[PDB]
Design a protein around this nucleic acid. Sequence first.
DNA 1: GCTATGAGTGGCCCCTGTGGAGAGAAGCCT
DNA 2: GGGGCCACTCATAGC
RNA 3: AGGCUUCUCUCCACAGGUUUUAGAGCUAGAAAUAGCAAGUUAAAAUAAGGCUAGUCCGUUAUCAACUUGAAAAAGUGGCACCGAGUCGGUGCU
Length: 1129
Amino acid sequence: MDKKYSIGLDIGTNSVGWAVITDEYKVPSKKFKVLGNTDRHSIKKNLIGALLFDSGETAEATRLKRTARRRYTRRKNRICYLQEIFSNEMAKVDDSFFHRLEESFLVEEDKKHERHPIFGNIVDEVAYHEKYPTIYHLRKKLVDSTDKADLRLIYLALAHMIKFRGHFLIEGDLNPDNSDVDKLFIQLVQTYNQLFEENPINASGVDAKAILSARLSKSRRLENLIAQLPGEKKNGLFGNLIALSLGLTPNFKSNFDLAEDAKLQLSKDTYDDDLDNLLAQIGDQYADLFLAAKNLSDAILLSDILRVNTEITKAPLSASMIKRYDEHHQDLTLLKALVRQQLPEKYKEIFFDQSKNGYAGYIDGGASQEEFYKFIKPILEKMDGTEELLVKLNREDLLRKQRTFDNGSIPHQIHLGELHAILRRQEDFYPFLKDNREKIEKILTFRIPYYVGPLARGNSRFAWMTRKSEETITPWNFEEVVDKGASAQSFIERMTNFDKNLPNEKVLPKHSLLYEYFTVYNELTKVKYVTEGMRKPAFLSGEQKKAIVDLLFKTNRKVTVKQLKEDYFKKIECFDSVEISGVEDRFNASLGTYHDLLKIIKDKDFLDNEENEDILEDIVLTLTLFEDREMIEERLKTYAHLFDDKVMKQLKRRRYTGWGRLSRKLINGIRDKQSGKTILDFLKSDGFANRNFMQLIHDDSLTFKEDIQKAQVSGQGDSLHEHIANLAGSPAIKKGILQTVKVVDELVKVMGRHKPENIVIEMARQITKHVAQILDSRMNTKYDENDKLIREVKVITLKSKLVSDFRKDFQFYKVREINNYHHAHDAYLNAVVGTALIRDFATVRKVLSMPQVNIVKKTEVQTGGFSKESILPKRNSDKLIARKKDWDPKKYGGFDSPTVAYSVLVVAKVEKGKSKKLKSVKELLGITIMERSSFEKNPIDFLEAKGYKEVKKDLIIKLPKYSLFELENGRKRMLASAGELQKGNELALPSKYVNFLYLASHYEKLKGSPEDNEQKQLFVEQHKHYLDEIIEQISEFSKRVILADANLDKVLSAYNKHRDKPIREQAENIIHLFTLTNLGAPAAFKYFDTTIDRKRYTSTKEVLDATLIHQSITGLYETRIDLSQLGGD
DNA sequence: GCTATGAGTGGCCCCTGTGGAGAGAAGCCT
DNA sequence: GGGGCCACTCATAGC
RNA sequence: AGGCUUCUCUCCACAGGUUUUAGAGCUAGAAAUAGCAAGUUAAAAUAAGGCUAGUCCGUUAUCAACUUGAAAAAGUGGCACCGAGUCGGUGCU
């Protein structure tokens, strides 16, 4: 017969539960055939088990490294551009110069030219390293000198600047010329007093210079200034200007009594023209003061980093670094003298041992700055004359390096200034530099805009750029090849979610005029009013709706029901008393866009004509899409013909954010077949029907729901990957979803394809309903006689606290730490409870004590980075992997620790010994991930390359990670890699022991009635003998399968060493002890006070004579292979 | 007599620090 | 967290 | 409707780190070694490379075994009963 049955499911972060139950709450056991070459020709198993797999990983690392790769490629491109520019002139001075630079990383033997990269003779190298100890001295030389310079040195300077061109946080142009804060602040005071001599603010008594110098919050510095500034406050004009210079965004209308509201941020780029915007209102006199404020802002911003170079030069950064170097040398000499004078013994320790964290480790070792300061500080405290050094160390300025993490704040404008100064000074002697100043400067300043995206030629799945001319994109001609305009549209449109009712349609901007119309009219649909004499509330008439909208909504930005009752019914309809329902004291909808556009354009008839609707909608869309004004101006240029220049300029300034939820072709695109009206038209006037959006979509009287039904055609059957990709949540749970789907498919395959009646599901931490919907779509595919689905399979969602309280009430405790059966038991209880809401407890106990549970470790082909990235120094081994195809690791060192893609069993002959004699062998060979393509290209070739001979192709068995092997006495192992094995057996602890362990674990944390607590305490106290039984069972299981004789002896000694402790402590230490036999990699643990190192099974020989297992996703189908009989010696 | 093998056994090692722009969600508050 | 690698020590097989 | 925080996806940039090489160590001493001197920077790579040859792409996800397929994809293993330490036995077919 067709046994009525249902399948329970448990979906988690790392595992999937599966179980089959009858209506009688039993668990049937069935017999399954075995394929392969074994003799165990039939196996019977319970229809319950749990699946395991690794956690899915977010894409974040992949995205990071993709972006990094692109940055590196573009940096190399910039160097190549500079070298192409220099090439022809460089050919005359030194032909091999760029060759020397390229091959500089090879050893003396490998190089094709002279070994000194720069000059090719050692004498000039020493001269260069004497005259310029660091590159910054050369940069200063080229900044200041009027003498003709060697072309090679200038190339070095320019390349150094380009390859580290710094950040682009600041827009505009910073002026390092305004080096000193104090005099600029005095100029600000003078200009402020000239503007306001009636109420001067005293400069004396204000410590602006130091406070601006002192490292404090911008709000903190502003507060300190207000305390110092007499008769002044933050929102006051002078304090507002100071905050503007600091970086706060103050509004300026209150100071000048302006209708316009302008919150300017000086650093922000829009400030540069919005300043002229505001000065157009407030007159020209206020302009120069804002200029001085900008100067003060630049002064403080740069002085925070340049460390106040009083030396009058155009390139502060080089001077600052050179000053730091000089102070470093001075302090080094002084420290050497003092330490040699007072503590002769530690000289070698501090200054020779690379392993220490002293100066030797700080320079020739790997010690950072902080560790060196930490080591050196106490020594200074034991000596004399260390006052200055300790003060400097409190500044973090002792013996400082030059290439450190501080430079992460240097703005690129400084590098640009030095570049320009060089190109100006040296142009007189070198003509070709003069022609290329623009190009070189652009190379530094240019970058691909964030919204354009990668410059790909179609064949890149991440690209959206549109290319006009087939010229190669180069920074000099970027503008003429790609369109910034058309590009940006595509960049934005990738994300705007499609309309639900019309999946092929894009949603409109939230601030669309059509959107405002829709919201206003629809909210008016369900408004009812009661006047005297009216027995029932009346729907507002379409004529009334139109008149009210025209009179109030197009005249008032925010309208209350009070205004309606006072203005329309009262004044026009002569109803003094009206009772209105459906709106709470004000309309939620508002025609804000209408008022703004009428404010700017000032043509009401233009806004009132439907013939202009497309124009307005396009305008709103454009004003929402972009954020750079220039492209908006480009797009608005289409409508400059109907509008004057000032109106056009005002439009280019408003901005909107947010998107709507409905599509144009929905609200005003689809028409009713009967009348030709749109949803908007029906809302505006629908007779006595006065239907809302919900009514208009769910009513069959109009063809709208027909079109929507026609619109939601089921998409073409996608691969499971894209079904996974659409959902919302952590991708691991999506992995679990796919696993559960395949589990259901395979289980239906098992039961003779007779579909189950019910499905009970639970989920770990909406998407649950999505999983249920996917399952129901897969299962129920019968449409009834009326094209309605027949629900032969019901899917019910249940919550975890249900089963939790079900366990706690009937005392079927779970302990996650004893084994992995708990997933299967939770799934089975899920199914049973779900069926229950649609012998029993004896059956529950009988099932839960079953030792046979189907646990399968899902095999995985490891993918990811080829190996570790921390490049290691050279050393004599064959276990390092070259960084390039031609860089022998012995000479150059390189990578280490590859990750094995998988392993294949090898049966061949090998030349062994000094005599090169053939021995027939059979072992595991691991394919590295980096070699996967080569091996799957032609395995025979790759194997022959490894030295194996007479390769027998058919013998190759493909063994992923967590391949499973069978050994004597049921001992099992999982293949972690080619050389390490993990435990493959489970400790089956009977039910009563588990319950006792739970009770003892919470012995002082049990929660229940006090009578229940006393019952459970007494039950624990009665069965104290359980301690030794559990200990001995662990011992016996270890002796059979784990083989941890040293560890087992240590554990047994520890248990005897502490046998006299209370129950709860002993139980907690028991919980720790289960780690020894858990499935997976061995893990160390603490038992009372003794640490047990993890035992690693570091040999894989014993499986070469074992029986291999291949399991279905639940293992109900098995194909066992005996490896002993193939390739016998 | 000597060398080579591998088989443990213990112990150590693993790239990091940011900023900007955008879209969606989700959770909290008003 | 868990696998790769090294230093050490050493029984063991081989010769 | 609005404000703040957190999460996912994509793009743009920055600063380091590492590696090797270059930056003539000197003296005494056959050497071991001892003494002294100096110590802050630079070039290149930053998953091997691939072909569609782009200022593109390479660490996400998907894959037990057998037959049919380039792959997506398709097909491939009996039933009931009594028992239970990784599952056993009995009967029909």
